[PDB]
RNA sequence: GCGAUGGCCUCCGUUGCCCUCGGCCGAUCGAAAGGGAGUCGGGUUCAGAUCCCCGAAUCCGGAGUGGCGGAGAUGGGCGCCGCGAGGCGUCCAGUGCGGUAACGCGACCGAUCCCGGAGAAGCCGGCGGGAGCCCCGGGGAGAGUUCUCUUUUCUUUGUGAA
RNA sequence: GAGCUCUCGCUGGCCCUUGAAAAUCCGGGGGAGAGGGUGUAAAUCUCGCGCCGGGCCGUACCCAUAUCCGCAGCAGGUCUCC
RNA sequence: UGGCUCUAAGGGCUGGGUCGGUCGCGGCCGGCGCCUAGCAGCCGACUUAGAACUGGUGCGGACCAGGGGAAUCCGACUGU
């Protein structure tokens, strides 16, 4: 898998046509967004909680953003 | 102490049957079969014992997967000959050409005198 | 006496331009407190013109007679001097040591060296300098 | 003999021992004489001869090898090429 | 003579193989394992790689010489004779 | 180079002929321990699971129309308009770039031909690095003894390939 | 921790012993040839992605004081790893 | 040659740039001490030698674990 340092790069990766279910895992200050693609599972780690909450609303097409629990 | 077995049918410990220990998330030591240690290409000069630098030491069939920049260095005879022997060849070629020019001039002078 | 002059020709013995022929445009041989070793700024040719053979024409002759130059500072131990000298103008205002800090200035220096080398390659002068070293 | 002149140069004159330093001295133009051992590599010998031709410097091919040249120069190590810059009171330079 | 009186290198063979045979071997055993002076670099790096072939550690020069010695007296004699004949022929 | 069909006979593919180029070195067989690109972790059956399920990868081949971005890439000069950013016309160069150097940057045209490397290497001794296991001083969790003592003794205390 | 095993790397000693071939892959010398002509193109030993496929055969168990060979559930023999 | 109680020897890591000035205990500069006979603190694997005491002279306490010397004949030996 590949880690992403930029939220804009994560959004560009998630906006792909081949992109699919993007899960959200709240890991007690280590919250992550994992987007599945054809070849790699791209991960984005957000330290802030409000930033992750705001990014939760950035999914364009109504994907499978269902969280992990 | 956890004793472990081979995961393949080649029970004999050969060159192709080399293994290493690895710990899994299941908390049990298992065998992982390691690839052979590749060697970097040697200089085409044939005199320097050392191997070429700036190139990955990997198997030849993995050289196919490797990119172009990893397989050579940006220089004349790059990735095939060492820089020391390259510059020695350059200066030797220049000096031999100069000597040939001098010999030709001397031969022409001798012909003119005779 | 000293034979490292701004008219001399050298052979580059190291770096990406190994084996290339260059003409010295500046010599230091004392130091700079930033480049302490004795050195010389030179302008060389990365790509030599191809053979013409006179069975070519006009457009193909022009295409073949192309020169790709470079400008570089080399240590004296990485240069091979020769008897031959090239009397190329190479106006010092464009080719200087400040071009190595700004990419645009180095681009202009390379363009100027290319123009001068291309205009001197014709007329059949210093044809030894425009022949690649066979090694 | 050349050995006595070399000994006098080492005692009084200025000398450079080695290849890299000798080449740098020749390029700077300070070296007035060059001495090459007979067992010198041919490529290095031709390089030194060409440099001395460019710098208008005399070259002498010493009869002995590098070990004998070092012994004559008074050094317990071996020297293959030697540069003489300014002899003190010897006639090593014609 | 610190440890052994008159065996030295052939002390590894012990009491075996006969005193005269060990004494005869000693010369060859010392000569083949002794490092000679390479007359290309001046270093004591000439080491017998195999039978009749010697290698310089520094020069990386390989020389075809004698089986146990770098230069044999027969080789020296034939080289001198060949040089003399060459000089006589060419004049 | 010639001839023909096929498909928006534009453009390409195909076969037929001619010219051209061309060393190999013997057809073939010969190793489930030699060489040989690339899969690991968890779960699962009464009995198979590096094979089945889940999750992460990777190798080779294809990719015509090329599906996308990115490298060859958007430079200089001259003459005009416009306060300015900028726009037009014309000459051009442009198969990359940096570091003295070892070399580096995601690419960075290329044939017949030639050179080289990997594949591809004996036995033994010494030393050093890393890992698996063992040891000790402790924290926890579960626990045998406790007629006397024992901050107790016993088990566990982790992370794959890429 | 000269602790046991595996692996990697240096360093040595021995040979009148010098300790394998081929498939396959890659690098380098050259410019035969291609490109569009001032905004585009030929090329990408393909830089990051995206699409399709990988066919055939073995896969259980014993591997040994009872699953092999010795007339047998034979004190015999049978090549390895932890 | 046991047991127990001691002694001696064989080592690693860190620490003084202390005074003044200045900036935010930390950093920079100046002349200082320059431990140049080294000291102070903290850690760790085993050994070697010696001393006393003591057991019903028993102590490589089970296990592992060479019988030697003087000669003769043959074959050098290793090996088969
Ligand atoms: Zn070399
Ligand atoms: Zn040598």
Curated annotation (Swiss-Prot), chain B:
Pfam family, one: Ribosomal_L34e
One Gene Ontology term, aspect cellular component: ribosome
Residue(s) carrying Phosphoserine: 11
PTM-bearing positions, type N6-acetyllysine: 35, 42
Cross-link type Glycyl lysine isopeptide (Lys-Gly) (interchain with G-Cter in SUMO2), residue numbers: 107
Domain of life: Eukaryota
Protein location: Cytoplasm, Cytosol; Cytoplasm; Endoplasmic reticulum
Principal subcellular localization: cytoplasm
Signal sequence, renumbered to the chain: none
Record GO terms (molecular function): structural constituent of ribosome
GO-annotated biological processes: translation
UniProt-listed InterPro entries: Ribosomal_eL34 (IPR008195), Ribosomal_eL34_C_sf (IPR038562), Ribosomal_eL34_CS (IPR018065)
Keywords: Acetylation, Cytoplasm, Endoplasmic reticulum, Isopeptide bond, Phosphoprotein, Ribonucleoprotein, Ribosomal protein, Ubl conjugation
Quaternary structure (record): Component of the large ribosomal subunit.
Family: Belongs to the eukaryotic ribosomal protein eL34 family.
PANTHER family: 60S RIBOSOMAL PROTEIN L34
Role this protein plays: Component of the large ribosomal subunit. The ribosome is a large ribonucleoprotein complex responsible for the synthesis of proteins in the cell.
Name listed for the protein in its UniProt record: Large ribosomal subunit protein eL34
Curated annotation (Swiss-Prot), chain C:
Chief localisation class: cytoplasm
Protein location: Cytoplasm, Cytosol; Cytoplasm; Rough endoplasmic reticulum
Family annotation (SUPFAM superfamilies): Translation proteins SH3-like domain
UniProt domain KOW: residue ranges: 6-35
Transport listed as a keyword: no
Keyword Endoplasmic reticulum belongs to the record: yes
CDD domains per record: KOW_RPL27
Highest taxon in the source lineage: Eukaryota
Entries under PROSITE patterns matching the protein: RIBOSOMAL_L27E (PS01107)
Keywords, ordered alphabetically: Acetylation, Cytoplasm, Endoplasmic reticulum, Ribonucleoprotein, Ribosomal protein
InterPro entries: KOW (IPR005824), Ribosomal_eL27 (IPR001141), Ribosomal_eL27_CS (IPR018262), Ribosomal_eL27_KOW (IPR041991), Ribosomal_eL27_sf (IPR038655), Translation_prot_SH3-like_sf (IPR008991)
One GO-annotated biological process of the protein: translation
Post-translational modification N6-acetyllysine, affected residues: 26, 92
GO molecular function per UniProt: structural constituent of ribosome
One Gene Ontology cellular component: cytosolic large ribosomal subunit
Pfam entry (one): Ribosomal_L27e
Family in the record: Belongs to the eukaryotic ribosomal protein eL27 family.
Assembly, per entry: Component of the large ribosomal subunit. Interacts with RRP1B. Interacts with DHX33.
Described function: Component of the large ribosomal subunit. Required for proper rRNA processing and maturation of 28S and 5.8S rRNAs.
Protein name listed in UniProt: Large ribosomal subunit protein eL27
Organism field: Oryctolagus cuniculus
Gene giving rise to this polypeptide: RPL27
Swiss-Prot record, chain E:
Taxonomy, superkingdom: Eukaryota
SUPFAM superfamilies, sorted: Zn-binding ribosomal proteins (SSF57829)
Transmembrane region(s): none
Keyword check for Ribosomal protein: yes
C4-type ZnF: 38-59
Sample GO molecular function, one term: structural constituent of ribosome
InterPro entries: Ribosomal_eL37/eL43, Ribosomal_eL43, Ribosomal_zn-bd
Keyword match Metal-binding: yes
UniProtKB keywords: Cytoplasm, Metal-binding, Ribonucleoprotein, Ribosomal protein, Zinc, Zinc-finger
GO CC term, one of those recorded: cytosolic large ribosomal subunit
Annotated Zn(2+) binding sites: 38, 41, 56, 59
Entry's localization field: Cytoplasm
GO biological process: one example: translation
Assembly information from the UniProt record: Component of the large ribosomal subunit.
Role according to the record: Component of the large ribosomal subunit. The ribosome is a large ribonucleoprotein complex responsible for the synthesis of proteins in the cell.
NCBIfam families: eL43_euk_arch, PRK03976.1
PANTHER family: 60S RIBOSOMAL PROTEIN L37A, 60S RIBOSOMAL PROTEIN L43
Family: Belongs to the eukaryotic ribosomal protein eL43 family.
Protein known as: Large ribosomal subunit protein eL43
Species whose genome carries this gene: Oryctolagus cuniculus
């Amino acid at each position: 898998p590949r880690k992403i340092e930029e939220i804009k790069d994560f959004l560009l990766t998630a906006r792909r046509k081949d992109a699919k279910s993007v899960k959200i895992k709240k890991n007690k200050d280590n919250v992550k967004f994992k987007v599945r693609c054809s070849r790699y599972l791209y991960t984005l780690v957000i330290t802030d909680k409000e930033k992750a909450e705001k990014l939760k609303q950035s999914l364009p097409p109504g994907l499978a953003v269902k969280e992990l629990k | 102490v956890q004793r472990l077995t081979y995961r393949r049918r080649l029970s004999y410990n050969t060159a192709s049957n080399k293994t290493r220990l690895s710990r899994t998330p299941g908390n049990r030591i298992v065998y992982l079969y390691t690839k052979k240690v590749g060697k970097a290409p040697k200089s085409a000069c044939g005199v320097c014992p050392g191997r070429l630098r700036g190139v990955r030491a990997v198997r030849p069939k993995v050289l196919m997967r490797l990119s172009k920049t990893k397989k050579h260095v940006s220089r004349a005879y790059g990735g095939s000959m060492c820089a020391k022997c390259v510059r020695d060849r350059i200066k030797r070629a220049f000096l031999i050409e100069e000597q040939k020019i001098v010999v030709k001039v001397l031969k022409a002078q001798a012909q003119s005198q005779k | 006496g000293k034979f490292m002059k701004p008219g001399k020709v050298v052979l580059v013995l190291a770096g990406r331009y190994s084996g290339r022929k260059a003409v010295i445009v500046k010599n230091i041989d004392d130091g700079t407190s930033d480049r302490p070793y004795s050195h010389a700024l030179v302008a060389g040719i990365d790509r030599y013109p191809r053979k013409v053979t006179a069975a070519m024409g006009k457009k193909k002759i022009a295409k073949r007679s192309k020169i790709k130059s470079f400008v570089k500072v080399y240590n004296y131990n990485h240069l091979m001097p020769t008897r031959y000298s090239v009397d190329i103008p190479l106006d010092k205002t464009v080719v200087n040591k400040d071009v190595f800090r700004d990419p645009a200035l180095k681009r202009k220096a390379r363009r100027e060296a290319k123009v001068k080398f291309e205009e001197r390659y014709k007329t059949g002068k210093n044809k030894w300098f425009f022949q690649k070293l066979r090694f | 003999s050349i050995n006595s002149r070399l000994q006098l140069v080492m005692k009084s004159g200025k000398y450079v021992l080695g290849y890299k330093q000798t080449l740098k001295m020749i390029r700077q133009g300070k070296a007035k004489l060059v001495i090459l051992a007979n067992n010198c590599p041919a490529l290095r010998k031709s390089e030194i001869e060409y440099y001395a031709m460019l710098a208008k410097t005399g070259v002498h091919h010493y009869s002995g090898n590098n070990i004998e040249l070092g012994t004559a120069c008074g050094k317990y190590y071996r020297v293959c090429t030697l540069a003489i810059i300014d002899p003190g009171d010897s006639d090593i330079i014609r | 003579a610190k440890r052994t009186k008159k065996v030295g290198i052939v002390g590894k063979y012990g009491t075996r193989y006969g005193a005269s045979l060990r004494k005869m071997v000693k010369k060859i055993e010392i000569s083949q394992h002794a490092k000679y002076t390479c007359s290309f670099c001046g270093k004591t790096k000439m080491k017998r790689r195999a039978v009749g072939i010697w290698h310089c550690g520094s020069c990386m020069k390989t020389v075809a010489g004698g089986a146990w010695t770098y230069n044999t007296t027969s080789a020296v004699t034939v080289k001198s004779a060949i040089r003399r004949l060459k000089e006589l022929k060419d004049q």
